[PDB]
């Protein structure tokens, strides 16, 4: 479900959107951050791990 929402996000975003431009150009950051910012963070770890 997380990967699907990330995919829908990457589709909906215009490619000149600044949050996309900054990641794609290789400037800084990955798309997992784009996905947790808009979309959903997904599963989070346990105190055990």
């Amino acid at each position: 479900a997380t990967d699907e929402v990330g995919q829908a996000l990457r589709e909906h975003y215009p490619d000149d959107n600044p949050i996309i431009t900054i990641v794609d150009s290789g400037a800084t950051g990955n798309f997992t951050q784009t996905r947790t910012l808009a979309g959903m963070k997904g599963l989070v770890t346990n105190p055990k791990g």
Partner: protein, 1092 residues
């Protein structure tokens, strides 16, 4: 719609949609109520009558009951202590700070002595010592410095079972441990670091029947304990009996806890030996795995392994209890000498005063407050620092675990911390996970367990009856959530509700299954954390950083409350205790920059002295200003004067800055920050920093120093600012290097240079022969001399041995924001100032308004703290004001929350609570109806962006930029404090290397990894030079200086003194080390220039 309870508190409109069914408790109660228990004040009497049984006993009363009566071995005499009373306080707080005293009160007790064979009963009032006292703000004053007693986390007494797995076949192996209030412990029956102990060799059972054990009778199990734990002595029949009877049955040695006894009796049975039988049955029936267990006389106990981090088995010992335990230690050390004197002296001639030596109790209290890891230098950079410091909980210290024996599971957020210990506020460094802060609404209970409040739920009906539950009680119930839909009359609208159960897991249960409900969202948060707008929009790393950095803001000369905040600023400022608050409602009778007098209605006068330009423990400036005018009618609790970081009663840790979010010419590259020079010209980030230089004239071998304005061969002009005493004059501007207090130190005759010898001979000089040891101002420091304090041995001023005079110069400096300074928002978005641009080349809006701060875009998205962006948008809204169009109805986006937020004047004060308040849709809506500027121009569009001009070329920037208003704090990390260089300075007498630290004008350390780096380059000569003629070559370095001064090449390097010292240490280890030539014996290590 917040702050209605506090009179005069400004009107901060709140986006919240939930009613607050419970106000914040006394944010210092964690400290006060503890100390008031320790002392037995009427406050605590009433507070225990309201929520406690009828027989209360304070800390000192309890210590006395436990100690009474001091009895002779023959039972011939008995001493009994009772009725602890306090006199008034010795000296006020400011007086104790000034004189370097300890705020304290004399402690008195009634000591009744009885001789059982003479009937003589001579009662007496004995004095126990100067008991240090807790101030209004919840601190102590020791040696004139203010200190906090941080609550400690420790395992409450009781028995605990766990389930390990053996390295044999992964078999489920049970184990147990009994932690006592006092004494030794045991495990399964291994006891006191002596393993190989069969559980059946000391007395349906699965393995209890299997015990392997070969013995019968009671002498075998009695002798085995003396032969297995008391070695160095033959096996006897009486000594083992005596030790076994004095081990756990004896109450003097083994102190059965009260909290511990409660926990254990709750674990086994309502009503020692019974306990040990129940424990053996528990371990057995846990090795089996049965749900419940039936013990003789006791019933209804679940067979389960206990969690060591659960807040129902992990207590904290507040200041009261730490003090109580130190007092108990002192009291036992006194009782020892009391009995030891009862023995020797004659009866009927010994009064309570004659056999009661208080020296050990005084020494115990002193050692506690002066060496305990839990009596800490009060963090008081600003009010929030101190407020969180008092509410803090740490697990290190004497009695807890070790900073190195504390693994990672200790530092993990346990689900029972919900509403008790905030999960965000904790250090980033080594102490992470070990130091938390008490949750906002949390409250400690008599047993040291952290309780939290919940609203009672009766038939799916949220009531107003609040109840405080501990971790255990909470686990046993189902707690609804705070943001749960509720209709008026307390009725859940949805068919089911989200809730939390004992397993630390969430569920969606029908409404009729809920027991309690959260009192409010953010119930889990701490004070600092509760002040981050849009917290839920920030990742826990940057939020933790934001809390920690709020606790580092420096007070500014002029403080400005945040344009957009939470609801916590007011209550935080008030409880913190750095604002003056009207203790009694009246009318301001007089107001000055110095004091404020209020005439109560009953004719009473009360007056408050304003702290004016006070130096804090960390150099920040504590300076109060009144906010009342003569003739003003003030209600009780109303704020009378603002403190260091407060504005009209609200925590104002920073300023509202016009921010533009866009990369600007790289000067904000990689987290740097660009500031408009306005912030310098208008002192928007200027702060006051007050340092205290100190110097004493004392007794030396060659005589006694003297504080004198007459210093050897100093220019009359240099002393131009010294008074007749040799002390700088008040209001004098001191640059770095100037004299602050002249002082000469007796110099020996052998030290006089040949030049000085001849000078004193020819001109017939006197025999003073002193050295200039005057107190000069250290590098990178300057300012106006605020103050001068002086203490003379001549006068009746108490000083240490051999210390004649002692003067302290208090110097203030105004620090303007500068390149290098560290700023940050409330969202963990830190950065140093890369450049401060002229206002003219700052990007500016259409109306020429130049932005104040440029925050690089590249920094926002990866840190997961868009909270700052939402804050920027709402801040621009608040700076411009708005009017939602109501004609034809209220739009759907503004329908839900907005009540009096439908319109707002420019510079409106709004609060967006955490986990409630401003919703994204509502933010956008407000952004649509921004009011225009003077000329009716809307400058920020509905996206929150605006065109901007390049103040450098003149051309506009091609694309709209997000501009807004952001709250920026000046964190206490300033270049003026961190710049430091050294060409040559003092060295250590032991290693002969440069001293370390700026304060000592030290040198930088070229560490081992740096030498690795240097080698990797192959810079042999650089590494040698760094390690020989810059550090240790005692002749090489002076040669190098001499060669640089005379334009000569740098000499060849010699031998590091540290090597000679290593050789000497080896030798002292009986190791014969020796340096050898190519073909030779050991080389040895160890005038004409002067005559020239």
């Amino acid at each position: 719609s917040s702050n209605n309870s506090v009179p005069g508190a400004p009107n901060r409109v709140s986006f919240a949609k939930l009613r607050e069914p419970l106000e914040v408790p006394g944010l210092l109660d964690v400290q006060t109520d503890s100390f008031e228990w320790l002392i037995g004040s009427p406050r605590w009497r009433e507070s225990a009558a309201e929520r406690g049984d009828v027989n209360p006993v304070g800390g000192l009363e309890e210590v006395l009951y436990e100690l009474s009566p001091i009895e002779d071995f023959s039972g011939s005499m008995s001493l009994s202590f009772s009725d602890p009373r306090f006199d008034d306080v010795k000296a006020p707080v400011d007086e104790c700070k000034d004189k370097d005293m300890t705020y304290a009160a004399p402690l008195f007790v009634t000591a009744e002595f009885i001789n059982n064979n003479t009937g003589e009963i001579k009662s007496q009032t004995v004095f126990m010592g100067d008991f240090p006292m807790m101030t209004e703000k919840g601190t102590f004053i020791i040696n004139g410095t203010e200190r906090v007693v941080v609550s400690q986390l420790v395992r409450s007494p009781g028995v605990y079972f766990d389930e390990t797995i053996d390295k044999s076949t992964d078999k489920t192996l049970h184990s147990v441990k009994v932690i006592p209030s006092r004494g030794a412990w045991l495990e399964f029956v291994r006891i006191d670091r002596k393993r190989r102990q069969p559980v059946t060799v000391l007395l349906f059972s699965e393995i209890m029947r299997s015990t392997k054990d070969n013995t019968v009778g009671t002498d075998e199990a009695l002798l085995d304990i003396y032969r297995k734990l008391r070695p160095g002595e033959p096996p006897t029949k009486e000594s083992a009996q005596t030790l076994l009877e004095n081990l756990f049955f004896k109450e003097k040695r083994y102190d059965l806890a009260r909290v511990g006894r409660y926990k254990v009796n709750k674990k086994l049975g309502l009503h020692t030996e019974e306990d040990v039988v129940a424990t053996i049955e528990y371990l057995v029936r846990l090795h089996e795995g049965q749900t419940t267990m039936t013990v003789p006389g006791g019933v209804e106990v679940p067979v389960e392994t206990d969690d060591i981090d659960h807040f129902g088995n992990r207590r904290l010992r507040t200041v009261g209890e730490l003090i109580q335990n130190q007092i108990r230690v002192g009291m036992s050390r006194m009782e020892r000498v009391v009995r030891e004197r009862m023995t020797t002296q004659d009866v009927e001639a010994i009064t309570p005063q004659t056999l009661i030596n208080i020296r050990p109790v005084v020494a115990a209290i002193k050692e506690f407050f002066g060496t305990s890891q839990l009596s800490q230098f009060m963090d008081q950079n600003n009010p929030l620092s101190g407020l969180t410091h008092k509410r803090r909980l740490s697990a290190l210290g004497p009695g807890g675990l070790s900073r190195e024996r504390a693994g990672l599971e200790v530092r993990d957020v346990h689900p029972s911390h919900y509403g008790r210990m905030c999960p965000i506020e904790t250090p980033e460094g080594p102490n992470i996970g070990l130091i938390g802060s008490l949750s906002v609404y949390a409250r400690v209970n008599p047993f040291g367990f952290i309780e939290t409040p919940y609203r009672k739920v009766v038939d799916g009906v949220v009531s107003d009856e609040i109840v405080y539950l501990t971790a255990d009680e909470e686990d046993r119930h189902v707690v609804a959530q705070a943001n749960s839909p509720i209709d008026a009359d307390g009725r859940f609208v949805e068919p089911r509700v989200l809730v939390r159960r004992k397993a630390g897991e969430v569920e969606y249960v029908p409404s009729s299954e809920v027991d309690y409900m959260d009192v409010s969202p953010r119930q889990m948060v701490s004070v600092a954390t509760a002040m981050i707008p849009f917290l839920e929009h920030d990742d826990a790393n940057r939020a933790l950083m934001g809390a920690n950095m709020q606790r580092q803001a420096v007070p500014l000369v002029r403080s400005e409350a945040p344009l957009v905040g939470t609801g916590m600023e007011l209550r935080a400022a008030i409880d913190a205790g750095d604002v003056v608050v009207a203790e009694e409602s009246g009318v301001i009778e007089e107001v000055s920059a110095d004091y404020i007098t209020v005439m109560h209605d009953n004719g009473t006068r009360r007056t408050y002295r304003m702290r004016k330009f006070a130096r804090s423990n960390h150099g920040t400036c504590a300076n109060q200003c009144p906010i009342v005018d003569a003739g003003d009618r003030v209600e009780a609790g109303q704020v009378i004067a603002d403190g260091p970081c407060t504005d009209d009663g609200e925590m104002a840790l920073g300023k509202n800055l016009l921010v533009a979010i866009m990369p600007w010419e790289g000067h904000n590259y990689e987290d740097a920050i660009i500031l408009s020079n306005r912030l310098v010209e208008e002192d928007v980030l200027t702060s006051i920093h007050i340092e205290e230089h100190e110097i004493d004239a004392r007794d030396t071998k060659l005589g006694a120093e003297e504080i004198t304005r007459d210093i050897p061969n100093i220019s009359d002009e240099v002393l131009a600012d010294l008074d007749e005493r040799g002390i700088v004059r008040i209001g004098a501007e001191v640059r770095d290097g100037d004299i602050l207090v002249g002082k000469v130190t007796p110099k020996g005759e052998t030290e006089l240079t040949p030049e000085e010898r001849l000078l004193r001979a020819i001109f017939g000089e006197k025999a003073r022969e002193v050295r200039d040891t005057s107190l000069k101002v250290p590098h990178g420091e300057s300012g106006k001399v605020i103050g001068i304090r002086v203490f003379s041995r001549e006068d009746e001023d108490e000083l240490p041995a051999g210390v004649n005079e002692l003067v302290r110069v208090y110097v203030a400096q105004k620090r303007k924001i500068s390149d290098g300074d560290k700023l940050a928002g409330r969202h963990g978005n830190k950065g140093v100032i890369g450049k401060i641009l002229p206002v003219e080349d700052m990007p500016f809006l259409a109306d020429g308004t130049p932005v104040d701060i440029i925050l690089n875009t590249h920094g926002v998205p990866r840190r997961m703290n868009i909270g700052q962006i939402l804050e920027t948008h709402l801040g621009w809204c608040a700076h411009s004001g708005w009017k939602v169009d109501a004609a034809k109805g209220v739009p759907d986006w503004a329908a839900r929350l907005p009540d009096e937020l439908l319109e707002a004047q420019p510079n409106a004060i709004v609060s967006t609570p955490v986990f409630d308040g401003a919703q994204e849709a509502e933010l956008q809506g407000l952004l649509s109806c921004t009011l225009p500027n003077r000329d009716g121009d809307v400058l920020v569009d509905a996206d929150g962006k605006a065109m901007l001009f390049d103040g450098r070329s003149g051309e506009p920037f091609p694309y709209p930029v997000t501009v807004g208003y952001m709250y920026i704090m000046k964190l206490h990390h300033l270049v003026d404090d961190k710049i430091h260089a050294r060409s040559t300075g003092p060295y250590s007498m032991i290693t002969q290397q440069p001293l370390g630290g700026k304060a000592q004008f030290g040198g930088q350390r070229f560490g081992e990894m740096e030498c690795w780096a240097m080698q990797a380059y192959g810079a042999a000569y650089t590494l040698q030079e760094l390690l020989t003629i810059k550090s240790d070559d005692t002749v090489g370095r002076v040669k190098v200086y001499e060669a640089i001064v005379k334009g000569e090449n740098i000499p060849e390097p010699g031998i590091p003194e540290s090597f000679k010292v290593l050789l000497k240490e080896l030798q002292s280890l009986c190791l014969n080390v020796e340096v050898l030539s190519s073909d030779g014996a050991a080389i040895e290590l160890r005038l004409e220039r002067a005559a020239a």
